[PDB]
């Protein structure tokens, strides 16, 4: 019945595609053609955080919009003070191969991970003045690509074994194992409600998963390359994906239709990090051509240029209140822009 | 300008000083990427001069060598290579036991040589499995794997042909494949690596000074 099963799967896929086509009736670009275009969004660096020797691979903004955690290949996890350009903490890392870093919503814990297949959770606020690792999470068979915090006790981590997992920090075990993804998952984004999270992989697929359900609900395809960075829309009803195919594409959960494709003829290199702003009007993506572009979400036009990073822009973040942006690049610098 | 901000600035300066001191102490470290095939070559090289990425550290002639074995992770190498981009040299291991593995080993070697990240990164090649290959080549001529081979069934000329075939995939200036053949039974291996490693720094320093 293998042939029958394959035929049934193909028929189901065709039915899904037909339903998606029927649901689509107009283009959002035409809908938002009436609104006034956003003017030239010129930005200037306000501070250049310095003190990484090797190249930076990840950063994360704090809940208070002041402290940010940055990870580089030198093995140092530096918690920054964006306002005063200080170094609150410098946590040495057991393995210098780190690709992701996470800052807990409460602020007490910080997560790091990478080619060591272990997610290290370090407690910043202790009775002693030192920063010690609270717990090392093991069990993944692949390199961790991204991790985000749900609470002080639950963390979601996407690994290189084409899977995601949810860990209870106090228990230290895998409560939920999100599987069923054919590409190496590289990034996950958490909705404000912290119940649905989208993970994008190397098979040009972005899968929506429910925290409580533990099983995939919706799948979005259409990219011509691997997915590198993902970010929910501020309302949590949509998201955007950046891929090596040199373009960013927006998806909506309810519609299940790809809405707009931010592509420019001159731009040809891949995508490392991407994130939305406070209102979702501006979508920031840093590319490999030593530059970052800021796209209008509804106008689909490159309206902002963020230049000054000599090397590849690796990580990008937007503050919780959305007033500032941080771009950490391979040139060992994090630049804060307003 | 206030008090605890002055104390915080003092702590920031102390942290920066400690960070710079740690970085200078990391200057005397040699990062050697290891991207060989895993049939019988990697284990001997790891153990003689001594599941995520495996770091093996050893000191030799005032140099700290750190070998990074990435095998066993079973993932895409396109996400791997860019991380290991600042390594001084790439050690490659080639096993002469199985002729079938030679073709894909050579293809992987060509792919490593042709990466944009490794365009100016030198390669140290290790044709392992000496004695058994010498004993076996008499029974099995180097014809099934390489029909284009037109030479006597001898150990030395066949080894030279293999070395030439491997190094023919360089196709790049400012890069040289330092080739050596180790028995993996009784060797003075690390010393050889040291010599090889030294050259890269000198060459790098030359390009640093503009003398080229």
């Amino acid at each position, epitope marked *: 019945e293998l042939d029958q099963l394959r035929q049934e799967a193909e028929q189901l896929k065709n039915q899904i595609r037909d339903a998606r086509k029927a649901c689509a009736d107009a283009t959002l670009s035409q809908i938002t053609n009436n609104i006034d275009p956003v003017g030239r969004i010129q930005m200037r660096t306000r501070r250049t955080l310095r003190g990484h020797l090797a190249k930076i691979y990840a950063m994360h903004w704090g809940t208070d919009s*002041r*402290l940010l955690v940055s990870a580089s290949q030198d093995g140092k996890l530096i918690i920054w*003070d964006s306002y005063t350009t*200080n170094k*609150v*903490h410098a946590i040495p890392l057991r393995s210098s191969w780190v690709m992701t870093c996470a800052y807990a919503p409460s602020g007490n814990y910080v997560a790091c991970g990478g080619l060591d297949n272990i997610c290290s959770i370090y407690n910043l606020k202790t*009775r*002693e*003045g*030192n920063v010690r690792v609270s717990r090392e999470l093991a069990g993944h068979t692949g390199y961790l690509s991204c991790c985000r915090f749900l609470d002080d006790n639950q963390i979601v981590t996407s690994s290189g074994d084409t899977t995601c997992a949810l860990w209870d920090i106090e228990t230290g075990q895998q409560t939920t194992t999100f599987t069923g993804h054919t590409g190496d998952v590289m990034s996950l984004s958490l909705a404000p409600d912290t119940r649905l999270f989208v993970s994008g992989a190397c098979d040009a697929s972005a899968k929506l998963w429910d925290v409580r359900e533990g099983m995939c609900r919706q799948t979005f395809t259409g990219h011509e390359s691997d997915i590198n960075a993902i970010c929910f829309f501020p309302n949590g009803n949509a998201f955007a994906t950046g891929s090596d195919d040199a373009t960013c594409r927006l998806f909506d959960l309810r519609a299940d239709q790809e809405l707009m494709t931010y592509s420019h003829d001159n731009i040809i290199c891949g995508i490392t990090s991407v994130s939305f702003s406070k209102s979702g009007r501006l979508l920031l993506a840093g590319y490999d051509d030593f530059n970052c572009n800021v796209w209008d979400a509804l106008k689909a036009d490159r309206a902002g240029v963020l230049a000054g990073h000599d090397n590849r822009v690796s990580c990008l973040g937007v503050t919780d209140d959305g007033m500032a942006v941080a771009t950490g690049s391979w040139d060992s610098f994090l630049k804060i822009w307003n | *300008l*206030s*008090a*605890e*901000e002055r*104390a*915080a600035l*003092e*702590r920031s300066k*102390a942290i920066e000083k400690n960070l710079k001191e740690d970085g200078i102490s990391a200057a005397k470290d040699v990062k050697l990427l290891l991207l060989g095939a895993d049939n019988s070559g990697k284990s001997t090289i790891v153990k003689q001069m001594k599941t995520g990425i495996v770091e093996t550290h050893f000191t030799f002639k005032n140099l700290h060598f750190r070998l990074f074995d990435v095998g066993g992770q079973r993932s895409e190498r396109k996400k791997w290579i860019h991380c290991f981009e600042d390594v001084t040299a790439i050690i490659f291991c080639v096993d002469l036991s199985d002729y079938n593995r030679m073709h894909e080993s050579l293809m992987d070697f060509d792919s490593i040589c042709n990466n944009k990240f490794f365009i100016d990164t030198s390669i140290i090649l290790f044709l392992n499995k000496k004695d058994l290959f010498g004993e076996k080549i008499k029974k099995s001529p180097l014809t099934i794997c390489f029909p284009e081979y037109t030479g006597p069934n001898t150990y030395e000329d066949a080894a030279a042909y293999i070395q030439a075939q491997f190094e023919s995939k360089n196709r790049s200036p400012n890069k040289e494949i330092y080739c050596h053949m180790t028995c993996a039974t009784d060797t003075n291996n690390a010393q050889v690596i040291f010599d090889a490693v030294t050259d890269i720094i000198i060459a790098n320093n030359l390009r640093g000074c503009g003398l080229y």
Partner: single-chain antibody, 231 residues
């Protein structure tokens, strides 16, 4: 974490003796530490401060030019060198930890202290000497400052301390709003420049003591007069 101090004793006037303190289960090289004396019947007052790595060394004008402080990080010890002692320097000495970064909690732990017997700044003024209180009743404690304690950074520097009878002092509120670690949520603090308030809703047992003001706007650390709680 434990801070144990020794070297206190009877000293002839005009002499010189050193006091020492050792810390266990604690990171020493990253903390700026303070020596503070308490008069036998009067309130607390500052003595000296050693920074992290001994970058800066500060003294009080009462002991300026006669007192020195030294930290031995490898020895994990702190030394107070005293000379030219006076009959007015008899006091119970306390050594305190203080770590300085964004959102830190300085002065959170106080040592046991050692007794010593001998043979301009911003003034802290507490109007009320003592207040008779009953359990379950809210009590308000006020501090007044000669100069505004609010800087241009956006936070006001003031600390709240409780003097447990026959025990080391404890930290309650730092920077006017943030409770310390392990303190009950009943305590609260608020106010503004020149008018600073502490409130204890639903007062309970073991809360009796003397309440002290503190400032960090500028170095001299003139403490509050104190307010005794009577059961």
């Amino acid at each position: 974490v434990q801070l144990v101090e020794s070297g206190g004793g009877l000293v002839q006037p005009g002499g010189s003796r050193k006091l020492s303190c050792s810390a266990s289960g604690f990171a020493f090289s990253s903390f700026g530490m303070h020596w503070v004396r308490q008069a036998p019947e009067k309130g607390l007052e500052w003595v000296a401060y050693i920074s992290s790595g001994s970058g800066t060394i500060y003294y009080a004008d009462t002991v300026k030019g006669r007192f020195t402080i030294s930290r031995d990080d490898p020895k994990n010890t702190l030394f107070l060198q005293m000379t030219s002692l006076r009959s007015e320097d008899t006091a119970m000495y306390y050594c305190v930890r203080s770590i300085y970064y964004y959102g830190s909690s300085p002065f959170d732990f106080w040592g046991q202290g050692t007794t010593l017997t001998v043979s301009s700044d911003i003034v802290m003024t507490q109007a009320t000497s003592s207040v008779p209180v009953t359990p379950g009743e809210s009590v308000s404690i006020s501090c007044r400052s000669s100069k505004s304690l609010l800087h241009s950074n956006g936070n006001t520097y003031l600390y709240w301390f409780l003097q447990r009878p026959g025990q080391s002092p404890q930290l309650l509120i730092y920077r006017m709003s943030n409770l310390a670690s392990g303190v009950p949520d009943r305590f609260s603090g608020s106010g503004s420049g020149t008018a600073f308030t502490l409130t204890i809703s639903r007062l309970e047992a073991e809360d009796v003591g003397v309440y002290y003001c503190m400032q960090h706007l500028e170095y001299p650390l003139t403490f509050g007069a104190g307010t005794k709680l009577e059961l």
